[PDB]
Design a binder for this molecule. Structure first.
Ligand SMILES: [Cl-]
Ligand SMILES: [Cl-]
Ligand SMILES: [Cl-]
Ligand SMILES: [Cl-]
Ligand SMILES: [Cl-]
Ligand SMILES: [Cl-]
Lengths: 173, 173, 173, 173, 173, 173
């Protein structure tokens, strides 16, 4: 069949197509989070920018997986993309809790694919994930944990004040 | 309900959410077209770049609709995104024929929304489509028609030669 | 014996010396391919430049292995270098088919050495190959597969025309 | 407990805290080596600079481990730091022999932690060590071995002359 | 014994070695304070930077003492370094109270060494401390007192809000 | 047969292919000499650089011969390349004695080919060797003779000292 494929299992090829769907789902989730915080009755610009940047980051992860699929001689296959889990995302705290749950689900999927690649003795796959995904994910989850702690300390007796101050003084606008 | 909404019908709000889904579907279609032409057994770089640029253009149309939805005080609602119509896209000619069918479907959806806005006496909506969508679509469909004519004249007795030459001498690589 | 050697097996040391011989053999093969396409009765400058650049790339892989051998405290040992498999390399298509066979043989040798290093719990060796060899090889084999597809589509009824056009419009001159 | 911790064993967390202590011990050893060669009755500036730079390099390795500990959601724990093994370090040859023994002890600790991470299927840990520690250590031990050979060839009949010349013509002052 | 030593008592030499240990202990304390505020469940970047800068300042004080010891012809002697007094440092207020207690202990040690040097008629020692340590310490303790007053005024009814605001609007991030 | 060949004997064509093998053998010899002096138990950087530069110079002589072979319409033919005469090269003096023996063997081969070209009344060949090879060889052999005299004068009673000093003060590092 393939003129270039070498040491690239059907199991890894399939798992890469599934991981693309997970990253595009995550990208779509962040697009929805961004436009919720852009609503005139929510109006938290720095929160909107935080999640819009993540929509782009997750799309770029999908793009790198698809590029690698073709570099290895697998076939990119696209499936339907489910809509995000919510239409309205609550407070900045609710949204950042949803985001860290989403990132730990992507991180577990990365770790599971790395374990498959290790079992299949596919060092190019293992290095690819180590070099472009695992540390990106650890650093993002650490950032979200930092943000969750600062959001939680600002709730106090005065949730609205804390939510304003976090968006103004931690996030970019 | 909304503090800003003025002269913005529920019919237009719903039709804008549907049009976002159509543009994101089109974006996803172009992502698939791009990665098909990137395959080592297809390998037409200028065709890959043509369709990848359209994936971005259609995403940007979805983004402008969502921005406008919030500017008017409607609620952005995301639905599932169906996968593209094909997994393999045939020749450059097959792909460019699929692309012009897709663009005429987006153009008809734009014209239908403009007619709804005109019936609802919503001049901001009508101007928005006139200023950011209708001419973009006319110019792209003219470009695709130009390309289809040049692809068709190169088929001759020697399809492979013509497909190479079109990618090398008309498309960007 | 060695003042610096640590966690560096005799098996890996020997396999690194063998891999140097394989890369220098490959370099010599590409020098022959380059000078064949430089003949006045072949005269395909872009094909000559493609293979001459690969002679340098394979020499550089041999040089990095030898540097690493000394960094680990092994002893570089040189053996005779067999001449290339052919004196005349046929068409650009014949030559590019020979080149992808040669690159998949180097890639398998890399994967076999990585497996030895993994079995010997030699993470410096494994990372060295992951960081400087495995992706270089995947990217080159993808490029050759792209080129083989474009060469094959240009054969048509008119092999000479296709061979000229590929050298003029894809390769660098 | 931890909001960010994922795939991070208590065994690795503890071993990282121990490795921090080993690197800070090594840093302190190099601070002592540097100030010994700064004595007016020793007075080998290039030897002082060599070991002072290593005090900084080992401190930076401790700092990167502590940063990573927090990125993974482990708890940095500091323990007492033992003083260096000697108060006086003898000749440049004695000092460079002590330094290579110290670096091979750090390298073995790195390899042992990498093996623990591999057993615990912790690819982020394994990649972290591969990317920031293993090659740094191989390159430093090779440099020290080079220096030991040049110091040994200069002993001759005239140790003082050789020790001066090595400091003047190989080390930086 | 020493070719350069002049007017440099054994009492001062010993007291300088003890003061080095006190400054390295203080440096290690500030390294621990810095990494505590870097935890994802503490996450006060400006507090982390404040204490990390002090780890460097205290290390530099140790380095200047060791340099001076050799300039005078004394022998630098290193002893074990005890770990910091706490593993967890509480609130920014708790940490800044611990820091001013630590700085007043270093200041008293400086004053005691100055008194020893004065009793031993060692004007080089006395001037050294006056020129590089006493004013540095007065200025730092004044800064910490300023910070303690601003932290205390922000506790109010809403400790978390005050702790965020102090880190955002007084400390550097 | 050849459309361009004119005044180019089969004897010269064959002798040029043999001379290519001699120059590639010499290049390989210098690669081995370079990596021997890079060993941590040899560690003479300026000696390593001297011989590595000669590996490149001899490769370039082979390349110019092959270019000229095609310019004249002869056929480049590659044969097996024997490994270098030694695996270990002894002292700098031993290595430089081996190198001058190797260069006088290349110089005699150049002179023999020039005599063949003169007998065959092939002035292009004779001028080619005069313009790109004979003086290069005379100048290199003079340089090596200069180096041998300086190495010999430094042996004295203290071989290691002399070998260090020559590498430090004559060769490039
Ligand atoms: Cl769903
Ligand atoms: Cl569908
Ligand atoms: Cl053979
Ligand atoms: Cl101890
Ligand atoms: Cl203690
Ligand atoms: Cl032989």
């Amino acid at each position: 069949s393939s003129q270039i494929r070498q040491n690239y299992s059907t199991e890894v090829e399939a798992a890469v197509n599934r991981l693309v769907n997970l990253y595009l789902r995550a990208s779509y989730t962040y697009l929805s989070l961004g436009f919720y915080f852009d609503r005139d009755d929510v109006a938290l610009e720095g929160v909107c920018h935080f999640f819009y940047e993540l929509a782009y980051e997750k799309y770029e992860g999908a793009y790198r997986l698809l590029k690698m699929q073709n570099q290895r001689g697998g076939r990119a296959l696209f499936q339907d993309l489910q809509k995000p889990s919510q239409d309205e995302w609550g407070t900045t705290l609710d949204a950042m809790k949803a985001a860290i749950v989403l990132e730990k689900s992507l991180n577990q999927a990365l770790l599971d694919l790395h374990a498959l690649g290790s079992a299949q003795a596919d060092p190019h796959l293992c290095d690819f994930l180590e070099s472009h995904f695992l540390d990106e994910e650890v650093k993002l989850i650490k950032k979200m944990g930092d943000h969750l702690t600062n959001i939680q300390r600002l709730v106090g007796s005065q949730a609205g004040l804390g939510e304003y101050l976090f968006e103004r003084l931690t996030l970019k606008h």
